């Protein structure tokens, strides 16, 4: 019994970040990397399944990315993931959600898990695409935005609740194995803050022609800092800031 | 050329985003001669033709599938067949929870052009150029789709304006491809939690976010809200944690505070999903120690200050 959890090490930008000279991305000097928030919940959900079960449940985390990602994978192991896999070659640089979907699927075909979990979206690019792309390449049952999962290892169906717009859920009975994209709030990750197996493209039968920017389903023309709305910033002491809020409250 | 628009309905109601997409599609097309094709999918979807017989709909296709409401296998098969039948240059889906279920699967099989959560779209010559966010909304990423004769876009809700008035589309009925879905929809659910106040009716909100830190800190903001005469609401994480009821949650998956005239956002970054519930509010005050917080891009007033210090001083001054 095996749950494979696809995880992403996301980038967040520091203040005063700048676009690269080529205009295709932000300068990496301004990026701080950490595990995608959604992945904390997906991993916790797999761990909850492992702990609920008498049957052995192997929890394997898999990420497609460069060597920085090892740090995130190690923390997943420290939190109780059984194994961790990083897939990379430089040729994979610029791979969009669909291409990463394809790469992940090549690993999943070999791991042959009973369930695959992915986050609903990434905090950085927020494609909300990768997990469901995996489901397509696997040709597996799937559901996106899962806020509750009723599943016992070995079951050929699960009941999920998807979190919908406007404060409602929908119960869905789904065939297993399945790919599920996991939503914030499904659980309360306990650690709220074994080597890593390194896999090349060759190791999974892929080449530069299968991956990277040229194989993606859109091309970046440019990235830029848009002019956005600007607030009226109330400077001063805490007293005068509060005083101004109350004046606005009284105006209202 | 044809632009295909996939409408969205749930629980017998058409989701308004459907009309936003039609607005988008009509704005997008290159000549008058171009046609907007709208499809509505569901086992009882004929119900929606009046609501979809609106300005800017040239053709309305009612697709009868096995499920009443969204099912990802049904929708994927159906939309694939629509694309096959209509050869659209562009397919517009809402960036909605339903679309999340299948949009990127559709795009994986066929290598159509694909981009999600798009909030600018135009033709430059014959080149489709879509813009979406990057790095937690801190940049715009502008993309095109070289050599893709069909591009599938999901469209950010509440960005594109609907057209006004009725239309006279040619209405057709098709059966969805015969696919046995690998899931079955069961009950819709509204989960427990207190519901003493309907936050869509209230005019003055103080809303708290993850910046409050610990559940022990909720009480002081409840007190401030009480003293000010505001209704206490929150962002999703606060409700997720059980610290306030889900009925107080503002945003896409919570409530839209349609009645709110003054919204004080405290320790809330301003995610797109939170903004969906409150960006319409005519006076938004944001209190947040991160000047790079998205919330400041829609707030009228910004205070870059510690929320606890502000809360204490507000309390003192009000009393
Ligand atoms: C499909 C889907 C649906 C969603 N629906 C919703 C929804 O309905 N509602 C919603 O809210 N979210 C929704 N989200 C969740 C969303 O992605 C965010 O996780 C959430 O909005 C972030 O909440 P936050 O602003 O409270 O926390 P964060 O983004 O972590 O913000 C915390 C903020 O507090 C500030 N802060 C910290 N300490 C202090 C201090 N001492 N003083 C002042 N400021 C401080 C920080 O600078 C930061 O900006 C949805 C997401 C998905 C994908
Ligand atoms: N490079 C990656 N490696 C592994 N999983 C990924 C990767 N990129 C995205 N994902 C998965 O997809 C989710 C993010 O959604 P998306 O916004 O579509 O990228 C993450 O939580 C992972 O589950």
UniProtKB/Swiss-Prot annotation, chain A:
Q: Does the keyword Ribosomal protein apply?
A: no
- SUPFAM superfamilies xrefs: Adenine nucleotide alpha hydrolases-like
Please name the InterPro entries in this protein's record: ET-Flavoprotein_bsu_CS, ETF_a/b_N, ETF_b, ETF_beta_N, Rossmann-like_a/b/a_fold
Arranged from A to Z, the UniProt key words for this protein are: Electron transport, Nucleotide-binding, Transport
* Entry keyword Cytoplasm: no
A Pfam family hit:
ETF
Q: Where does AMP bind?
A: 6, 36-39, 64, 119-122, 127-130
Q: A GO molecular-function term, please?
A: nucleotide binding
Check the record and name the SMART domains matching this protein: ETF
Q: How does it assemble?
A: Heterodimer of an alpha and a beta subunit. Forms a ternary complex with trimethylamine dehydrogenase.
Q: Can you tell me which family this protein belongs to? A: Belongs to the ETF beta-subunit/FixA family.
What is this protein for, i.e. what is its function? Answer: Heterodimeric electron transfer flavoprotein that accepts electrons from trimethylamine dehydrogenase. It transfers the electrons to the main respiratory chain via ETF-ubiquinone oxidoreductase (ETF dehydrogenase). EtfB binds an AMP molecule that probably has a purely structural role.
State what protein this is by name: Electron transfer flavoprotein subunit beta
Q: What is the lineage of its organism?
A: Bacteria, Pseudomonadati, Pseudomonadota, Betaproteobacteria, Nitrosomonadales
Swiss-Prot record, chain B:
The yes or no answer to whether the keyword Hydrolase is present is no
Q: What is this protein called?
A: Electron transfer flavoprotein subunit alpha
**Family matches, as PROSITE patterns:** ETF_ALPHA
Which terms does the UniProt entry file under GO BP? fatty acid beta-oxidation using acyl-CoA dehydrogenase
Originating species: Methylophilus methylotrophus
Q: Which gene encodes it?
A: etfA
Q: Which family does it belong to?
A: Belongs to the ETF alpha-subunit/FixB family.
Mind telling me which CDD domains this protein's record contains?
A: ETF_alpha (cd01715)
Q: What is the lineage of its organism?
A: Bacteria, Pseudomonadati, Pseudomonadota, Betaproteobacteria, Nitrosomonadales
- Keywords recorded for this protein, A-Z: Electron transport, FAD, Flavoprotein, Transport
Q: How is the cofactor bound?
A: Binds 1 FAD per dimer.
Q: What does this protein do?
A: Heterodimeric electron transfer flavoprotein that accepts electrons from trimethylamine dehydrogenase. It transfers the electrons to the main respiratory chain via ETF-ubiquinone oxidoreductase (ETF dehydrogenase).
- Binding annotation for FAD: 210, 235-236, 249-250, 253-254, 269, 271, 273-274, 288, 306-307
């Amino acid at each position: 019994m095996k749950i494979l959890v696809a995880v992403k090490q996301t980038a967040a930008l520091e203040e005063d970040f700048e676009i690269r000279e080529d205009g295709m991305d932000v300068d990496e000097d301004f990026m701080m990397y950490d595990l995608n928030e959604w992945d904390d919940f997906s991993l916790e959900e797999a761990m909850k399944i492992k702990e609920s079960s008498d049957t052995d449940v192997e929890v394997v985390v898999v990420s497609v990315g460069p060597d920085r990602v090892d740090e995130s994978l190690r923390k997943c192991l420290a939190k109780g993931a059984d194994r961790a896999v990083r897939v990379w070659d430089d040729a994979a640089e610029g791979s969009d959600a669909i291409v990463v979907g394809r790469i992940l699927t090549e690993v999943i075909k070999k791991e042959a898990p009973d369930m695959v979990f992915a986050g609903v979206q990434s905090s950085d690019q927020a494609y909300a695409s990768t997990g469901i792309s995996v489901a397509s390449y696997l040709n597996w049952p799937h559901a996106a935005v899962v806020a509750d999962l009723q599943y016992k290892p070995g079951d050929n169906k699960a009941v999920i609740r998807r979190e919908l717009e406007g404060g409602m859920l929908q119960e869905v009975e789904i065939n297993c194995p399945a790919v599920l994209t996991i939503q914030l709030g499904i659980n309360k990750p306990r650690y709220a803050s074994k080597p890593i197996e390194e896999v090349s493209l060759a190791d999974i039968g892929l080449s530069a022609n299968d991956v990277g920017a040229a194989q993606s389903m859109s091309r970046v023309r440019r990235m830029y800092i848009p002019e956005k709305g600007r607030a009226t910033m109330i400077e001063g002491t805490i007293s005068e800031q509060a005083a101004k809020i109350i004046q606005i409250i009284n105006e209202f | 050329s044809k632009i295909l628009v996939i409408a969205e309905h749930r629980r017998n109601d058409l989701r308004p985003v459907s009309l936003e997409l039609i607005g988008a599609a009509n704005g997008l097309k290159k000549s008058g001669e171009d046609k907007v094709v709208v499809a509505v999918i569901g086992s009882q979807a004929d119900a929606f033709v009046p609501a979809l017989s609106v300005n800017g709909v040239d053709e309305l296709v009612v697709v009868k599938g096995s499920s009443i409401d969204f099912d990802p296998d049904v929708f994927e098969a159906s939309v694939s067949a629509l694309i096959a039948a209509h050869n659209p240059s562009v397919v517009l889906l809402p960036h909605s929870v339903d679309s999340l279920g299948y949009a990127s699967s559709l795009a994986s099989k066929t290598g159509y052009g694909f981009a999600t959560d798009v909030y600018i779209v135009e033709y430059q010559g014959d080149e489709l150029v879509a813009t979406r966010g990057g790095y937690n909304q801190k940049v715009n990423v502008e993309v095109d789709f070289p050599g893709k004769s069909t591009v599938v876009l999901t469209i950010r809700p509440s960005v594109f304006k609907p057209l006004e008035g009725a239309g006279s589309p040619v209405v057709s009925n098709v059966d969805a491809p015969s696919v046995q879905s690998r899931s079955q929809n069961k009950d819709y659910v509204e989960v427990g939690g207190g519901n003493d106040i309907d936050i869509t009716t209230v005019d003055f909100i103080m809303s708290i976010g993850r910046g409050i830190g610990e559940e022990t800190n909720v009480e002081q903001f409840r007190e401030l809200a009480d003293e000010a005469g505001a209704t206490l609401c929150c962002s999703k994480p606060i409700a997720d944690a059980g610290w306030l009821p889900k009925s107080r949650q503002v945003g896409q998956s919570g409530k839209v505070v349609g009645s709110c005239k003054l919204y004080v956002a405290m320790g809330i970054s301003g995610s797109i999903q939170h903004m969906a519930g409150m960006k319409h509010v005519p006076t938004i005050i944001a209190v947040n120690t991160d000047p790079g917080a998205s919330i400041f891009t829609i707030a009228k007033y910004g205070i870059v200050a510690d929320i606890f210090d502000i809360e204490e001083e507000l309390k003192a001054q009000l009393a």
